[PDB]
């Protein structure tokens, strides 16, 4: 006899701002315009620095994480999409586990969406306060209570704005999902920036262009040893390399090739003779969502571990979760987990590190593949994309497989969809690991996310067109 | 060995099913791959170009706002 969790949250939902759904079906060009405007606002927020940060050259523990989360350090998007993803993951997992029973009624669905939003906002407030109190922007006593409050308010408002923009796009004002568009844009921007950045970084020997292409051209023009300068550009230790860019291009092509793999099931309209369609079961049936869920879970684990280590030094549980050390080895400060579970979860930086610590690399690979396969299987059940649900969608669409009853369709789909999901998740994890080992610019996870998001946006665009 | 069999049999079935899936997967035709790659490249170029320009414009703004 549990009082409904949604009923408990219902009074708070009224305070939550909710975007009105469009009364009229929006024109395709107008949807494109809305998507462009929302993206432009998101990019501006991504570039605007937070007010009152004290300039600390403190290590970035989350540099790999920020690219996936569409977060930029020291900006209004420092939190990025992490609260929204975390709240979605938690609420979906609770629904799948049946701890929270969501009724089919619109009131229950509306409450479920409001609860997920409310959790996202609560997480945004908690994370912003946590980041201010952890000294990421400087010591709280030195910054002062007023600055800390201002930063917390700014982060909360930025997260709320992002949540509203995502709602606006999802509700059909724009194309696709705002979270997906933001992630894809962030990754594309980061890769293009590293390729073409004109900024000069003062390496101890000399001022070196950050952008791999610009540095290559400058070195070739300025150096008598053109071959040596080219080799240095290919194998630079401190800045993005041309070889890394080539590796990224190779990964991008490989990912597209695997993305194209599909199993075509012949479907006929039962009502109308001669209409032949194929239902494509893609190899990556579950999309980037297994990656997103795995990365969000790992990100939350890292945040919790770094907080526990900062606040409760020397406790056995804290050491088990993670020990962080800031390694300023001739580079911008980076906080690496040197012990605990977080160390095993962290990607090895190079083949050399894999050779030095083979156990860590094996554990990381096994964890990534297992987690991706598990998340893919769970996601299909939670998402309503199971063979039964697809068969229901086909019955609603009056599409019937030739010679097979609608019940038969479920059995045939059930043969492929679970296998496709688990194998696709394993393949995605393997591709991510391979790209990370190859050192592709923008990260193996980032490149996979960008390619698949772009492909799904292109499919949406073609379908609408 | 029963515990080992209990772990091996699901994995062995999974490998067999994966082989079946790959065997029935239609591999993309070269024209289809080229079309997909071109569309993805265009989307990547557009988003990266917009982000790069926005960042470049903000950097002088962010050096006046924060630098001083």
């Amino acid at each position: 006899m549990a009082i409904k969790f949604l009923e408990v949250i219902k009074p708070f939902c009224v305070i939550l701002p909710e975007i009105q759904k469009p009364e009229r079906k929006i024109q395709f060009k107008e949807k494109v315009l809305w998507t462009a405007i929302t993206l432009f606002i998101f990019l501006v927020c991504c570039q605007i620095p937070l007010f009152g940060i004290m300039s600390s050259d403190s290590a970035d523990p989350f540099y790999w994480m920020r690219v996936i989360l569409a977060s930029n350090r020291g900006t209004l998007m420092e939190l990025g999409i992490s609260p929204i993803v975390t709240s979605g993951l938690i609420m979906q997992l609770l629904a799948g586990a049946k701890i929270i029973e969501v009724g089919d009624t619109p009131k229950d669905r509306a409450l479920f969406n409001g609860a997920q939003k409310l959790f996202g906002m609560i997480i945004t407030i908690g994370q912003s306060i946590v980041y201010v109190m952890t000294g990421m922007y400087g010591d709280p006593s030195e910054m002062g209570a007023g600055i800390c409050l201002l930063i917390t308010i700014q982060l909360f408002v930025a997260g709320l704005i992002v949540l509203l923009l995502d709602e606006l796009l999802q509700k059909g004002y724009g194309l696709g999902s705002g979270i997906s568009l933001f992630i894809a844009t962030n990754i594309c921007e980061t890769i293009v920036w590293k390729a073409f950045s004109p900024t000069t970084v003062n390496t101890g020997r000399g001022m070196e262009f950050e952008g791999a292409i610009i540095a290559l051209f400058h070195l070739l023009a300025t150096r008598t040893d053109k071959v040596r300068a080219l080799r240095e550009a290919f194998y630079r230790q401190n800045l993005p390399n041309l070889m890394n860019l080539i590796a990224t291009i190779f990964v991008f092509a490989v990912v597209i090739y695997f993305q194209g793999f599909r199993v075509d099931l012949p479907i006929k309209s039962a009502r109308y003779r001669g209409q032949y369609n194929t239902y494509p079961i893609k190899l990556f049936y579950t999309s980037n969502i297994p990656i997103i869920l795995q990365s969000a879970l790992v990100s939350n684990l890292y945040v919790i571990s770094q907080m526990l280590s900062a606040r409760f030094s020397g406790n056995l549980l804290v050491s088990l979760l993670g020990t962080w050390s800031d390694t300023s080895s001739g580079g911008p400060a980076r906080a690496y987990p040197v012990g605990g579970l977080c160390h095993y979860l962290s990607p090895p930086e190079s083949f050399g590190s894999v050779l030095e610590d083979p156990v860590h690399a094996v554990v990381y690979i096994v964890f990534m593949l297992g987690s991706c396969a598990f998340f893919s299987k769970t996601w299909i059940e939670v998402s309503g994309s199971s063979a039964k649900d697809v068969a229901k969608q086909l019955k609603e669409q009056q599409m019937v497989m030739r010679g097979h009853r609608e019940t038969s369709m479920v059995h045939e789909l059930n043969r492929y969809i679970p296998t496709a999901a688990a194998f696709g998740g394993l393949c995605i994890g393997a591709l991510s690991v391979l790209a990370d080992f190859l050192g592709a610019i923008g990260s193996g996870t980032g490149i996979l996310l960008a390619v698949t998001i772009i492909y799904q946006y292109f499919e949406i665009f073609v379908k609408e067109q | 060995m029963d515990q080992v069999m209990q772990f091996v049999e699901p994995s062995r079935q999974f490998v067999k099913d994966s082989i079946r899936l790959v065997k029935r997967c239609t591999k993309p035709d070269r024209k289809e791959f080229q079309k997909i790659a071109m569309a993805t490249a265009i989307g990547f170029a557009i988003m990266g170009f917009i982000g790069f320009f926005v960042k470049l414009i903000h950097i002088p703004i962010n050096n006046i706002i924060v630098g001083g």
């Binding site: 701002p17 909710e18 975007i19 009105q20 809305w34 405007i37 606002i41 501006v44 927020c45 605007i48 620095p49 007010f51 009152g52 209004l76 201002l150 700014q154 408002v157 930025a158 704005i161 509203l164 923009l165 606006l168 004002y173 | 706002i65 924060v66 001083g68």
Partner: peptide
């Protein structure tokens, strides 16, 4: 809340952050 109000609120917040930066510079100077 309408989409246009959401956009207006986002733009106002961005402008407010810029104003806060300007005021902070004036107070420091």
């Amino acid at each position: 809340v309408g989409p246009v109000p959401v956009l207006v609120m986002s733009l106002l917040f961005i402008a407010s952050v810029f104003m806060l930066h300007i005021w902070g510079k004036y107070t420091r100077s």
